[PDB]
């Protein structure tokens, strides 16, 4: 099985690194073409053994599974460029926000009538094989196409099927989620430094605290509120800190963030019309 990447190099690098680290694909079975790929990600992909080309048509001819990371305003040009090169064997997997299955199918059907299209919402931690991925299957995706995509993406993290109309919300939650965590870890480290810890220790402790808490929740049958209750002793340090989070509307800020990212993806889709 050959895999190709067209579009944003950040997507190509993350999944190629995860796939090769998982051992589910040899690097020479991966080809990538990009217009925005920087020297760092170009050099990193070459050193991995990934094939690189400036020609999107070459990526299509190489690939069985073709990942697209192409924004809605560029989709008409790319699909017109490669549409005639899509074959019966191809599964086209689109990863950019605001690009609907319907838009891709309509554009590709101008060339061949039953394009196999899947939409993917994944995130950067696939690079350490702890991604969160959902996918939705298109009109002509065979049932084995969804199973194949789930097997591939489960090698680099959590993966499950959803209806397409949930992808905007997933984007606001686990797509953008890692950036919320990086912000939180920077701030928690600032807090540790304010209270006297060296920066490097503060970053390590905060990141380990977040990793361990998330793993506890994933391996627990308990509600996150129950785990919060279990850790906070009466009159203790943690419940005092939880009060100051509540006084700042901490919960509402995170709700605001998921909502804002989700709505922005809907706006990006409306700009494709």
Please give the annotated binding residues for L-proline, written as ranges: 164, 237-238
Provide Rg for the chain, Cα atoms: 21
Q: Calculate ∠ Cα 213-217-218, nearest 5°.
A: 115
Contact window for a copy of itself (CB under 8 A) among 48-56, 58-66, 138-146, 196-204: 196-204
Report CA torsion sign: 104, 110, 111, 114: positive
| Contact status: 261 vs a copy of itself (CB under 8 A) | yes
Out of 43, 102, 142, 183, which residue is the one contacting a copy of itself (CB under 8 A)?
A: 183
Q: What residue 249 binds from ligand A1JKQ, a copy of itself, none (CB within 5 to 8 A, per partner kind)? A: a copy of itself
Taking the complex as a whole, the smallest distance from the CB of residue 233 to ligand A1JKQ amounts, in Å, to: 4
DSSP H or E stretch at residue 135:
strand 131-137
Out of 61, 158, 164, 272, which residue is the one contacting a copy of itself (CB under 8 A)?
A: 158
> Per-residue x/- marks for a copy of itself, 201-230, CB under 8 A?
xxxxxxxxxxxxxxxxxxx--xxxxxxxxx
Per CB under 8 A, contacts with a copy of itself among 20-39 are 36, 38
Out of 102, 142, 151, 252, which residue is the one contacting a copy of itself (CB under 8 A)?
A: 252
Angle of the 101-109 helix axis to the 75-82 helix axis, nearest 10: 40
| Contact status: 7 vs a copy of itself (CB under 8 A) | no
The number of beta carbons lying within 10 Å of the beta carbon of residue 231 is 12
Burial 125-161 (b: 16+ CB within 10 A, else e): bbbeebbbbbbbbbeebeeebbebbbebbbbbbbbee
Q: What residue 158 binds from ligand A1JKQ, a copy of itself, none (CB within 5 to 8 A, per partner kind)? A: a copy of itself
Contact window for a copy of itself (CB under 8 A) among 85-93, 105-113, 136-144, 155-163: 155-163
| Contact status: 189 vs ligand A1JKQ (CB under 6 A) | no
Q: What residue 47 binds from a copy of itself, ligand A1JKQ, none (CB within 5 to 8 A, per partner kind)? A: none
Q: What is the secondary structure of 228-245 as a DSSP string?
A: HHHH--TT-HHHHHHHHH
| Contact status: 236 vs a copy of itself (CB under 8 A) | yes
CA distance 208 to 49: 32
Burial 197-219 (b: 16+ CB within 10 A, else e): beeeebbeebbeeeeeeeeeeee
Q: Are 178 and 124 in contact (CB under 8 A)?
A: yes
Three-state SS at 114: coil
Out of 39, 143, 233, 248, which residue is the one contacting ligand A1JKQ (CB under 6 A)?
A: 233
Per CB under 6 A, contacts with ligand A1JKQ among 69-108 are 69-71, 95-96
CA distance 171 to 259: 10
Contact window for a copy of itself (CB under 8 A) among 43-51, 55-63, 106-114, 239-247: 239-247
- Interacting residue ranges for ligand A1JKQ, rule: CB under 6 A: 7-8, 10-11, 14, 69-71, 95-96, 122-124, 233
């Amino acid at each position: 099985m050959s895999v190709g990447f067209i579009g944003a190099g950040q997507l190509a690098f993350a999944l190629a690194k995860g796939f090769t680290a998982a051992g589910v694909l040899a690097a020479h079975k991966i080809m990538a073409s990009s217009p925005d790929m920087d020297l760092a990600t170009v050099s990193a992909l070459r050193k991995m053994g990934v094939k690189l080309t400036p020609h999107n048509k070459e990526t299509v001819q190489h690939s069985d599974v073709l990942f697209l990371a192409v924004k809605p305003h560029i989709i008409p040009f790319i699909l017109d460029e490669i549409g005639a090169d899509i074959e019966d064997r191809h599964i086209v997997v689109s990863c950019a926000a605001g690009v609907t299955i319907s838009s891709i199918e309509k554009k590709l059907s101008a060339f061949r009538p039953a394009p196999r299209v899947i939409r993917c919402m994944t995130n950067t931690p696939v690079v350490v094989r702890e991604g969160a991925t959902v996918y939705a299957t298109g009109t002509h995706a065979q049932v084995e196409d969804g199973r194949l995509m789930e097997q591939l993406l489960s090698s680099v993290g959590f993966c499950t099927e959803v209806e397409e109309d949930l992808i905007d919300a997933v984007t606001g939650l686990s797509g953008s989620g890692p950036a919320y965590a990086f912000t939180a870890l920077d701030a928690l480290a600032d807090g540790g430094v304010k209270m006297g810890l060296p920066r490097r220790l503060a970053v390590r402790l905060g990141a380990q605290a977040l990793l361990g808490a998330a793993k506890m929740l994933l391996h627990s049958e308990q509600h996150p509120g129950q785990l919060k209750d279990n850790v906070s002793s009466p009159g203790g340090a943690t419940i005092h800190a939880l009060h100051v989070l509540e006084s700042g509307g901490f919960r509402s800020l995170l709700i605001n963030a998921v909502e804002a990212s989700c709505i922005r993806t809907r706006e990006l889709q409306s700009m494709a019309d």
